[PDB]
Amino acid sequence: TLNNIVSSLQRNGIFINSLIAALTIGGQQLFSSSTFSCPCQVGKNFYYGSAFLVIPALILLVAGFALRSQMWTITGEYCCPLECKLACLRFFSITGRAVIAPLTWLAVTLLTGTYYECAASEFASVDHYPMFDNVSASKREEILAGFPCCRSAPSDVILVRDEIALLHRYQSQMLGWILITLATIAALVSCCVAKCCSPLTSLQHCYWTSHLQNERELFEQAAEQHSRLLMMHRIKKLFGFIPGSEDVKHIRIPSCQDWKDISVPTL
Amino acid sequence: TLNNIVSSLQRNGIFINSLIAALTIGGQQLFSSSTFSCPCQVGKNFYYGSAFLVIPALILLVAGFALRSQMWTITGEYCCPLECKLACLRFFSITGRAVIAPLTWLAVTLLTGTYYECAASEFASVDHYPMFDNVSASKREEILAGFPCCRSAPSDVILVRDEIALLHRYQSQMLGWILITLATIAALVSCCVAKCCSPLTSLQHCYWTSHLQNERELFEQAAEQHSRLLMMHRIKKLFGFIPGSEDVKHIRIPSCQDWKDISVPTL
Amino acid sequence: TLNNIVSSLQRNGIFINSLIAALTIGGQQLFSSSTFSCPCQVGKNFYYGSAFLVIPALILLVAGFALRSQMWTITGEYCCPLECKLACLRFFSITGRAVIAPLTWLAVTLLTGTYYECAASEFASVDHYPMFDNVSASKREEILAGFPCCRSAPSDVILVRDEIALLHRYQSQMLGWILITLATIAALVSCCVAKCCSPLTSLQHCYWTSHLQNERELFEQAAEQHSRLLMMHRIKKLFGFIPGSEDVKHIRIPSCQDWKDISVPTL
Amino acid sequence: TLNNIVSSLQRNGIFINSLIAALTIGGQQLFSSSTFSCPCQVGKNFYYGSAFLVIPALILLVAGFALRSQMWTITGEYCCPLECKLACLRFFSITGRAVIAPLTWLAVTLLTGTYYECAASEFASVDHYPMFDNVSASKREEILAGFPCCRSAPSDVILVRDEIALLHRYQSQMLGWILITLATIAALVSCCVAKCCSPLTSLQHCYWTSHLQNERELFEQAAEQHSRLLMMHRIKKLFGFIPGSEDVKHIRIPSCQDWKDISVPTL
Amino acid sequence: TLNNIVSSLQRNGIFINSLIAALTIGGQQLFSSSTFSCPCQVGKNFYYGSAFLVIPALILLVAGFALRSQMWTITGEYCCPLECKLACLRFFSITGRAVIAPLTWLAVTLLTGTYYECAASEFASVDHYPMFDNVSASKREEILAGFPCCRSAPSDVILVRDEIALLHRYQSQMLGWILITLATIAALVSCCVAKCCSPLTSLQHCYWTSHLQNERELFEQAAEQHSRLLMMHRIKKLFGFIPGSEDVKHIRIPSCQDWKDISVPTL
Amino acid sequence: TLNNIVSSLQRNGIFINSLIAALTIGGQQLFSSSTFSCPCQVGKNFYYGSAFLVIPALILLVAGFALRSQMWTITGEYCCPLECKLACLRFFSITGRAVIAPLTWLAVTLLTGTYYECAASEFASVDHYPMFDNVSASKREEILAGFPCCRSAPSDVILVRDEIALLHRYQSQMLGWILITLATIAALVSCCVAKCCSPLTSLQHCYWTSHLQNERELFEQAAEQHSRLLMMHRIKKLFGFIPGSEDVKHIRIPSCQDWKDISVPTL
Amino acid sequence: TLNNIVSSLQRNGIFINSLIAALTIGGQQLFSSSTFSCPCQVGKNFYYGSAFLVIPALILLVAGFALRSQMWTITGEYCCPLECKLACLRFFSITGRAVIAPLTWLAVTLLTGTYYECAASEFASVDHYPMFDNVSASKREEILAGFPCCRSAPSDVILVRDEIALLHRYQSQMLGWILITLATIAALVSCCVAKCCSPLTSLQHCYWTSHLQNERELFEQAAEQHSRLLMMHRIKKLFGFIPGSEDVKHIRIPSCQDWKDISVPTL
């Protein structure tokens, strides 16, 4: 009864997507809490933010795309009528499985907001503040870039720093919610257009998916058994018996040529 | 049902790669936290950093290459047409399995950044600082090399030290992300060119891999059983019975010559 | 299914080597943390270091060599053509299994570096220091040998002591990495030359190894059963029945001579 | 499958030797930490040290010798050609099993070194010290014997005490390592000469050992069953039935003489 | 498989002796730590020590002697040629089993030494001490007997008290080691003379021991079954059926005389 | 296999005696630590001590005597030749089982000694003390009886109190050891005289004990089954069927007289 | 094997009595520690003590008497020769089972003594005290009744209070021990006279007890089965089938009269 429920869960795409999202959330939390520290330099801040903000998303998207076995077969069908549309729907299902990880990464890393603070701590619009009128541009950038990591100045500085930080947190969380909403709407309309352009009815689709799955599994098992039988026959030609038999009555000692015979596997 | 899932996991290259990466991450964490200490000498710092940065990567790469049994057979096929391409694809799969460990080692040890600080704490560009103009070159190197390990000087020194350390941490993490991105792109394009140059179709590849695996396993088992039968027959010639039989009726006491007979195994 | 995986692991030389290395690492850690203390005398320091550095390596190497049963049989074949090369390859495999322990001992005890500090705390090159010019040679050695174990002097002394200790730690860890690299290169080229000088092909080697293993096991079991049958027959001659039978109908009481008969085992 | 692995471990002499060594190490640790205290008298110190250093070794050696059943049979063969050499090899195996305990006791109790400090705290060579010139011989011995257990004097006394203690610890640990090395070399050359003087080949030895083991076991079981049958027959002569039968139809009440009959066991 | 190993351990005299020794050690530790307190009177100290030192040893020796069932049968054989020697060897084995407990009690209670301090705290040789010259004999005994339990006097008194206590601890532990060595030597030479005077060979001894054990067990079981059958027959004569039968067809109501019949068991 | 070892332990009188002794020790410890407090009155102390010292011993002895079922049957045989001696031996075995509890109670409560202090704190021989010469007899008793429970007076009083308490503890523990030794000697000589006066040989005794045990058990079971059959037959006469049968075909409704029939059980 | 030991324990009256005594001890401890508080009024103290001292004993005695099923049947035999004596012995056994609870309640609540202090804190004999001569009778009672619960007066008052409390504790514990001894003696002599007046022999008693037990059990089971069969037959007359049958072929729908038929159970 164990493998029954195991396969029932494996079929559930919802469970797999939930597992992927939860693992990405935990990994993002650990990654941020462990190996993140603002450089607070003059020009090397925005890049340090955008790297952690963007690069893991691209990496996880590429990983979700390439790690899917069926994607390789589909590309091989494409790489050097109805088949085109069915391949399009297969590619669509693969993309739907893959997109979950980078999307949840972006969403969580924006809702936490600590990356955006260190990302755009230099573009802060400072125009109506009492302490930022006399200072030159260079020292202005210098004292503005020192806000995110630490604080050491009198109370007015920490007040304006908290204000700027709260503004940037608001901007980050708003961007995160906008991304969530836009992504959900896009996914919904994409599933809708996929249902619209599907040449199969509601029932033929189920049969088609089951057909693809069963095809891959059965061909794997059958090719395995066939090659096993062939190698067993070559072994019987070499030694003179079957590896599975018991109390073998004839044992043919190999000669110096039959080793050369078995050296090549005939591909 | 246990061995079913055990073999199912063993087949999953993703699981094995995840295990290798996690073990390397844990080992790197323990290794760094336990047996690392900056020498903070005048010329013996960059080497102390580059050693921990580089040598374990080379060692783990060589270990991932040599520990693969199939690699030895392939090299023996090479060491003193279609076969060439199939051997190339096998070598490619072995390299794909092996490269994971040193890559993750480099990635984690750069993202942590504590090795790079002690690695290039001497090349620090000190040109626009108030305390480093009057001091001579030798004492400048002396006070610059004492930054990474400890702090003992007044507040200006600790301020410039924190600034230099943050700059170097930024550089280290940027190098780590660049390495990650470049490596992922290289792996993707390499899998692409491997799919392009493959003389087999999408289905022949599965049969070929299953064929190699089954060939190795079946030949091992068959050679074992054959040698066991041969040694059992020599034992029956020595003592006069089969090691597996029960209630043996004839027991031939060995003579002083038959010991010499069994002394050599006939290779 | 238990003994299946047990034997599968036992076959894996990688698992056994990993276990040996981990056990040696743990033992070295406990040994160093428990029963090590620097004597800090004038001439009795370098020996106290080199002992812990060297002697356990030699002991573990001898233990890895002598504890291998096959090594005794090979030496007996040597002690008072093709056979020579096959024995050479067997000796090579035994050496490959054995060398792991002293190598990992040296590697870990050098990477930790605490043994090297107490080993060469007397050869410290003291030529450009402000406090070591007026002092005579004897008191110089006296105050130099008191550095590794403890500290009791003013701040200049502890500063120069920390500098010397860091220099020696750097030297120790560099020597450790050099040893690791040289040993790995030597092992690789030795496996290469072993593959080069092997008179067997890639397939004959597998059969040969399985043959040796099965030969030893089957001969053990067969000799055991034969001697058991012989002793059972002598027991039947003494008492008048078989130790395995039930409801024995005849019981021959032994006489005063048959005890003398069974006193000798006929070798 | 339990008793399979139990017997497999029992055969492994390495496991038994490891267990003996570990138990002796633990016992020595507990014994030293619990019931040891330096008397710090004038002439009663060296004996108090040498007792704990020596006597347990002799006791454990005698225990390892006498507790071996086969040793008693061999001595009986000796006590009031080829047989001599085979008995010599058996005695050698027994000695090899037995020697492990006192050797590890000496090794651990010397490496810990706390016994040697209290053992030779009187032979300390005091000739170049500032406080030991004016004092007479008797008070010199008195203040020298009070060093190991406690300290109560000014700083110069505790300094010279720590120096003497470190010197004696160095001497103790050096003696321990010398003992370890000499013992390992002796054991190796003794196994070598045992292999040299063995009249049996490499294969006859295995058969001989299995023969001895099976002989002892089978004779025990057979003698047990024979005596059981004889006593069962005497019981049937007394009461009139077999202790194993059920629904016995005849019950012979014993008479006043048959009790005298069963009083003696006929030896 | 449980009772197999249970009986295998029960046969091992080494295991039983180890259990007895460990239990006696634990009991001695608890007994000493719980219910021991020095009276520190003038004449009632040596007895309070010697009681705990001696009486438990005698009690445990008598318990080890009398609790052995075979000892009672042997004494009955003695109480109102070859048989004499065999009974002597049986008595020897019983003594060897029994002596372990009082010996280990004495050994542990002497090695701990706290009993000997309170035992001979009055015989202290006080002849060369500065405070014990003017005091009379009575007050001398009074202040000497107050040392073991407590301390309340100035520093010179506590110094001489610690010296006397250390001297007595040394004496106690030396006596303990002497007892251990003498006892082991006596046991060894006694086993030797037992092997010398044994009229049986090495093999007849095993048969004899197995014979004694099997004799006792089989006679117990057979006598039990015989008496059970006899009582079952008397019950059938009383009630009219067998206690083991089912669906009994005849039930004989007992009369007023048959109760008198069953009142006596005919011995 | 459970009930096998359960009955094997139940047969072991040593195990039952150990359990009784341990339970009595624990109960005495709890009883003393919980509900004991010295009254410290003028004449009501010795009784308060002797009660706890004596009464539980008598109670436990009576409980060990009366709770034995066989003792009741033996007394009934006595209450209104060879039989006399056999009954004497049975009574002896019962007494040997019973005496353990009060003896261990006395032993432990004397070795702890806290009961004896409160028992004879009035008979203290006070004749050579500096503070007890001027005081009258009444106040002397008053201040002497206040020693065991509490202390409130100056240091001389607490000193003499500790001295008296230590003297009484010594007396108590000496009495306890004397009781232990005398009791063990008495038990040994009593077992000896029981072996001397036994009319049975060593083997007839085993048969006799097994006979008594089996007699009681078998008669119980047989009487139970007989009465069960009789009541089942009366039930069949009442209702018309057997309580064990199924699908009974005839059901006889009872009449107003048969209830009167079943009202009496015919004894 | 579970129910075997369960019934074996249930038969053991000793186990049931131990359980009852332990439960009563625990309940008394909890009851006293939870809901007891001295009123310390002028006339309402002795009643508050005697209530907790007496009433629970009477309640537990009545509960032990009435809760026994056999007691009801015996009383019904009595309520509106040999039978009289057998009923007397049955009543005796019931009383022996029942009396344990109130006796142990009284014993424990007297040995703890806290109830007796609050019970007779007014009858304190105050005649030779320095502070109780001038005070009138009313205030004397007032200050005497305030002793048990609390203390608030100077040291002389607390001294005389502790003295009175210790006197009353002594009296309480003495009364408890007297009760224990008298009760045990009464129980012993009562069992003796019960054995004396028993018209049955030692063996007829066992049969009689087993007869009573089996009679009750078998009659219960048989009456149950008979009534079940009768109701099943009435159900078959109502509906037309048996409640236990399967695939019933005829189903008789009930009419408006047969409901009236089944309305009465015919008693």
Numbering used by the authors:
A (entry chain D), B (entry chain C), C (entry chain B), D (entry chain A), E (entry chain J), F (entry chain I), ...: 4 to 83, 94 to 280
The publication says:
In humans, the CALHM family encompasses six paralogs, some of which function as non-selective channels that are permeable to large substances such as ATP. The CALHM subunits thus constitute unique modular building blocks that assemble with different stoichiometries into large membrane channels. Despite the unknown activating stimuli, our study has provided insight into gating transitions of CALHM channels by showing two conformations with either a cylindrical pore of uniform large dimeter within the membrane that is constricted at the intracellular side as in case of CALHM4 and a conical pore that continuously narrows from its extracellular entry towards the cytoplasm as in case of CALHM6.
In each case, we found a heterogeneous, about equal distribution of particles with two distinct oligomeric states. Due to the slightly higher quality of the Ca2+-free sample, we continued to use this data for our further analysis unless specifically indicated. The cryo-EM density of the decamers extends to a resolution of 4.1 Å and undecamers to 3.7 Å, which in both cases permitted the unambiguous interpretation by an atomic model. In each structure, the subunits are arranged around a central axis of symmetry that defines the ion-conduction path. Both assemblies contain pairs of CALHM4 channels of the same size related by two-fold symmetry that interact via their cytoplasmic parts. In the plane of the membrane, the dimensions of decameric and undecameric CALHM4 channels amount to 110 Å and 120 Å respectively. The diameter at both entrances of the pore measures about 52 Å and 60 Å for decameric and undecameric assemblies respectively, thus defining the properties of an unusually large channel, which could be permeable to molecular substrates. Even at the constriction located at the intracellular membrane leaflet where the respective N-terminal helices NH project towards the pore axis, the decameric channels are about 20 Å and undecameric channels 30 Å wide.
